[PDB]
Amino acid sequence: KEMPQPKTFGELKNLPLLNTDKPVQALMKIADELGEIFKFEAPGRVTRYLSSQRLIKEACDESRFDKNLSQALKFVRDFAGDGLATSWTHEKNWKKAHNILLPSFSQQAMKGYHAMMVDIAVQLVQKWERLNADEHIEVPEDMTRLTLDTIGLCGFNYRFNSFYRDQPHPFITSMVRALDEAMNKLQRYDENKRQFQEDIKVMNDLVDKIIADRQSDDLLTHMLNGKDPETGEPLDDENIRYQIITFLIAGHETTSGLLSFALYFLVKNPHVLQKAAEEAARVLVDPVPSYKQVKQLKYVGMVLNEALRLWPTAPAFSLYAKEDTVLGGEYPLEKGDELMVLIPQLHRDKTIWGDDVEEFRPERFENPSAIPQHAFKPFGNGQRACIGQQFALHEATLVLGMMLKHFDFEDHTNYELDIKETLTLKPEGFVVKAKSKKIPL
Amino acid sequence: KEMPQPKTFGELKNLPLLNTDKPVQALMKIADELGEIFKFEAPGRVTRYLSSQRLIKEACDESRFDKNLSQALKFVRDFAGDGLATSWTHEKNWKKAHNILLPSFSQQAMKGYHAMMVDIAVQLVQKWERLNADEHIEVPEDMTRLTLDTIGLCGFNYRFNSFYRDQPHPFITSMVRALDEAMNKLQRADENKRQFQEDIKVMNDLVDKIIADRGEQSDDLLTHMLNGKDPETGEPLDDENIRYQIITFLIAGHETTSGLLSFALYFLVKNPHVLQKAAEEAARVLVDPVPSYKQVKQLKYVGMVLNEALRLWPTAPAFSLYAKEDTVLGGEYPLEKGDELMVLIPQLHRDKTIWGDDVEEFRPERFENPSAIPQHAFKPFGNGQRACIGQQFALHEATLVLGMMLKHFDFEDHTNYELDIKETLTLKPEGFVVKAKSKKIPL
Numbered sequence: 001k002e003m004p005q006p007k008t009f010g011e012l013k014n015l016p017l018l019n020t021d022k023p024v025q026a027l028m029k030i031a032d033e034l035g036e037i038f039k040f041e042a043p044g045r046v047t048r049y050l051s052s053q054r055l056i057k058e059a060c061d062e063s064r065f066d067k068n069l070s071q072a073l074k075f076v077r078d079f080a081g082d083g084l085a086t087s088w089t090h091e092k093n094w095k096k097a098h099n100i101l102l103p104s105f106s107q108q109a110m111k112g113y114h115a116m117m118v119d120i121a122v123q124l125v126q127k128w129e130r131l132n133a134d135e136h137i138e139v140p141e142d143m144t145r146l147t148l149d150t151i152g153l154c155g156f157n158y159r160f161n162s163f164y165r166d167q168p169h170p171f172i173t174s175m176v177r178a179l180d181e182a183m184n185k186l187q188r189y190d191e192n193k194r195q196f197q198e199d200i201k202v203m204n205d206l207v208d209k210i211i212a213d214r215q216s217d218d219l220l221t222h223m224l225n226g227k228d229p230e231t232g233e234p235l236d237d238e239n240i241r242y243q244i245i246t247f248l249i250a251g252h253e254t255t256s257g258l259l260s261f262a263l264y265f266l267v268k269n270p271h272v273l274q275k276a277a278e279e280a281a282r283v284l285v286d287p288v289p290s291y292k293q294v295k296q297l298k299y300v301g302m303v304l305n306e307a308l309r310l311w312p313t314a315p316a317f318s319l320y321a322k323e324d325t326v327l328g329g330e331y332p333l334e335k336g337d338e339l340m341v342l343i344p345q346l347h348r349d350k351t352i353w354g355d356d357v358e359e360f361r362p363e364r365f366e367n368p369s370a371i372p373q374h375a376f377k378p379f380g381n382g383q384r385a386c387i388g389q390q391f392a393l394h395e396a397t398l399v400l401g402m403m404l405k406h407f408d409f410e411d412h413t414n415y416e417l418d419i420k421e422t423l424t425l426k427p428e429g430f431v432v433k434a435k436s437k438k439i440p441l
Numbered sequence: 442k443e444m445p446q447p448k449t450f451g452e453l454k455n456l457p458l459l460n461t462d463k464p465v466q467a468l469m470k471i472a473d474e475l476g477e478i479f480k481f482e483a484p485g486r487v488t489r490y491l492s493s494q495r496l497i498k499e500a501c502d503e504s505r506f507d508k509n510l511s512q513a514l515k516f517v518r519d520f521a522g523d524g525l526a527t528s529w530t531h532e533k534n535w536k537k538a539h540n541i542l543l544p545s546f547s548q549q550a551m552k553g554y555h556a557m558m559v560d561i562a563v564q565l566v567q568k569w570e571r572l573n574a575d576e577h578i579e580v581p582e583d584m585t586r587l588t589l590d591t592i593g594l595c596g597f598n599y600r601f602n603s604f605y606r607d608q609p610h611p612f613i614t615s616m617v618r619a620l621d622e623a624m625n626k627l628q629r630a631d632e633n634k635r636q637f638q639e640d641i642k643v644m645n646d647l648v649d650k651i652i653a654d655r656g657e658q659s660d661d662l663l664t665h666m667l668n669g670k671d672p673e674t675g676e677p678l679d680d681e682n683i684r685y686q687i688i689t690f691l692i693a694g695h696e697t698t699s700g701l702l703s704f705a706l707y708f709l710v711k712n713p714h715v716l717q718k719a720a721e722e723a724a725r726v727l728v729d730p731v732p733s734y735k736q737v738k739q740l741k742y743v744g745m746v747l748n749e750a751l752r753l754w755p756t757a758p759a760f761s762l763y764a765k766e767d768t769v770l771g772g773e774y775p776l777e778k779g780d781e782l783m784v785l786i787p788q789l790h791r792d793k794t795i796w797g798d799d800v801e802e803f804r805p806e807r808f809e810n811p812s813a814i815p816q817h818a819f820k821p822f823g824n825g826q827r828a829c830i831g832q833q834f835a836l837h838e839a840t841l842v843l844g845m846m847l848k849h850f851d852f853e854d855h856t857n858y859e860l861d862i863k864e865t866l867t868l869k870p871e872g873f874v875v876k877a878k879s880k881k882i883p884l
């Protein structure tokens with residue numbers, strides 16, 4: 001009944017607890033101390049961080065809870081607008097864009113994106129096989145190059161050409177700076193605000209240009225010509241730009257974190273890497289992986305799911321109670337009461353996964369049916385779950401599969417996991433050396 | 442390319458090779474001679490026995506191979522029906538029961554079964570401490586008493602009370618004779634069939650009775666079967682499949698597990714250093730009169746002992762696969778769609794390229810770090826979504842029971858028992874007997 005709350009800071013309540021560069025990990029440590037639920041108060045806001053499958057499975061009841069816009073999401077809404085990720089479920093443009101865009105993210109739609117995913121994946125592999133001796137790989141940097149280019153290419157046939165740059169594409173640099181500003185205001189300026197609007201313009205001008213410029217096999221085509229079966233309406237141009245902005249953000253950084261964490265856990269667990277590398281070798285018998293071969297990379301997918309278990313790169317989502325309801329039979333919630341699902345802690349729930357929750361064990365996902373309901377939520381929940389899950393997973397499986405096929409990897413620095421936090425998670429400074437297996441493409 | 446084939450018998454092809462009392466061990470010797478793969482032909486059937494991890498890791502690719510119903514399983518299907526073990530993956534009742542029953546077999550659901558496992562384990566321990574001096578233990582017999590009662594109690598809140606009997610429960614004798622007829626039917630070209638139907642009825646009537654008897658809510662498999670709804674179809678199991686699952690879980694829940702404990706204890710008394718190390722772990726971990734669930738999980742070496750026992754003698758010694766599509770096995774054995782494979786698990790577990798030269802030695806330390814074992818090298822519980830749903834059940838039960846056995850008794854191989862592996866559809870060390878000197882630790 002009496003809900004635990006972490007230390008307060010006078011009138012600031014718990015807000016300064018987020019005044020840290022690693023708020024998710026700070027929240028997880030708080031979850032370690034306080035348990036499955038703790039109240040988090042900030043000036044003018046109360047939320048509850050859920051960390052157990054017991055409570056989160058109720059929070060995932062869409063008849064009782066709907067997606068809430070966290071303060072993080074509300075600030076991403078400043079440039080993602082009513083894009084899919086920053087729109088409320090009851091906003092007409094969410095279900096509209098949902099129905100319009102869901103066929104473009106089906107498992108069957110991955111077949112159309114596969115070639116362009118390979119295009120970028122080949123560029124990644126070519127970059128690494130072209131490295132000189134003793135040179136190392138900046139993993140999250142290269143994973144972001146790949147995921148950004150993959151969503152750019154697969155999403156609206158735009159080549160960010162990140163592998164031709166060291167300084168990222170002006171869109172990416174503005175987007176990150178905006179996202180950073182979006183995060184800074186959570187734990188918080190006319191220079192910041194003008195820069196924010198300028199970064200908004202840099203993002204929007206690119207996007208808005210390409211909409212006017214444009215049949216490719218991409219998300220933009222479906223956005224330009226797709227009609228919502230419900231309303232019969234297509235997305236208007238302002239929402240299409242918001243979706244592109246949404247897909248550029250939501251399409252790259254969580255996926256690059258996944259690949260970065262996956263490779264980190266692989267090089268930290270050589271036996272797991274060996275299983276994954278040997279599967280990659282046995283399955284990817286062609287110079288270019290086919291869609292079906294990527295689907296055949298069962299273990300690589302398990303590696304990715306386990307990476308998503310330990311470090312879900314979109315580490316939280318927010319919910320609000322649609323009506324008065326009792327959470328877990330002991331925590332009464334009033335209509336509109338907010339919940340935060342602390343996904344990394346949920347994925348460390350000892351009652352679901354056993355005691356070895358901190359161990360990287362892909363075999364937890366041999367049989368996905370075995371995972372209890374709502375125990376594994378790296379892609380969110382219900383109709384507001386990640387529309388790009390199959391995209392992210394297909395890309396990450398394809399890329400990780402090719403990486404393991406073509407290179408032996410060395411944790412040459414004995415890298416100490418340092419998880420940099422934006423709105424997503426990434427192992428900062430994670431570097432490896434890759435010894436090419438000299439398998440041509 | 443050209444697949445080896447063992448000796449043939451004219452029109453019977455290789456079938457008379459299975460007309461033997463130890464067909465698995467016969468197949469292992471054949472695998473010893475012919476290697477990682479051999480074609481096995483019988484009238485109206487061709488299959489291929491795989492024995493190397495190299496080929497079995499491909500056979501375990503669920504995108505290429507799905508569980509096949511071996512002729513044994515096809516005959517067990519006569520009374521296990523479309524229960525989980527004898528149903529095809531594409532049968533609606535498989536995925537239904539799969540999704541419905543997986544929560545009842547989670548490692549977290551083992552916590553709910555633990556007390557009833559202890560209930561039976563304590564009965565086993567008290568039976569042995571109540572033996573008089575110089576009296577011996579019939580090991581597989583008592584392991585079957587325990588595993589049958591544990592699945593009976595944990596599965597459907599039914600007490601077979603096997604420790605109150607010398608002649609096993611009428612269900613078991615009917616079940617064994619059914620399995621006997623099912624196994625004997627492999628070599629079949631009216632009294633046998635009438636007896637077979639009667640044994641089915643003995644099983645069905647009891648099972649159906651408890652289903653009809655069961656509105657008490659127990660913490661068992663039967664509750665999940667009666668109230669569980671498949672999240673996919675939204676459907677519960679109907680009563681005809683629930684009866685098949687109980688029959689399935691009664692068969693699949695005890696004898697393979699009892700064989701494990703029987704083989705485990707066999708290898709322990711045959712390896713006193715392994716026994717002492719496991720016994721010392723039991724003493725260090727089982728500090729309470731009744732083992733807790735967490736203490737069982739801490740019996741790491743006991744768990745390694747069981748895995749090594751499952752390595753040498755996987756008590757469900759084979760499973761069958763069929764090629765979902767045309768595919769090439771090992772880059773040299775082209776398979777047509779529907780082509781059958783048998784995974785000869787004991788031979789797989791003797792793959793020198795995986796385990797080293799000492800594959801016949803009982804060395805639980807092989808399992809110190811399970812991560813080190815390559816994929817599909819150790820398959821005592823089958824493969825993929827068709828793997829043993831009760832693996833964690835069997836292992837928790839066996840670890841708990843073996844842990845308590847090692848805590849409470851010093852064991853003597855007083856006959857210097859010569860391993861004689863009885864073959865039904867499972868493996869057990871027939872006639873394996875020990876003496877237990879009680880350590881006089883109360884419960």
Ligand code: HEM
Pocket residue numbers: 067073084085086098151246247250251252254255256258308312313314316317318377378379380381383384385386387388389391392393
């Ligand atoms: C490993 C990679 C990814 C992870 C971990 C991830 C995670 C998530 C999570 C947790 C949510 C729910 C957020 C919330 O409820 O507030 C979400 C939603 C979303 N994601 Fe992802 N995502 C990934 C990749 C992608 C990709 C590749 C795309 C696009 C191509 C994408 C687009 C979206 C969109 C549009 C939504 C909002 C869906 C809606 O509400 O209708 N994501 N994602």
Ligand code: HEM
Pocket residue numbers: 508514525526527539592689690693694695697698699701751755756757759760761820821822823824826827828829830831832834835836
């Ligand atoms: C050491 C003990 C055990 C061993 C070695 C073992 C082994 C196996 C193997 C190899 C399979 C796959 C057979 C095939 O693919 O044709 C299997 C399946 C199965 N086992 Fe076990 N098992 C054991 C204990 C148990 C227990 C304790 C239960 C129930 C509580 C159980 C219930 C089942 C079921 C229902 C299946 C079929 C699963 C499915 O196809 O969905 N087994 N077992």
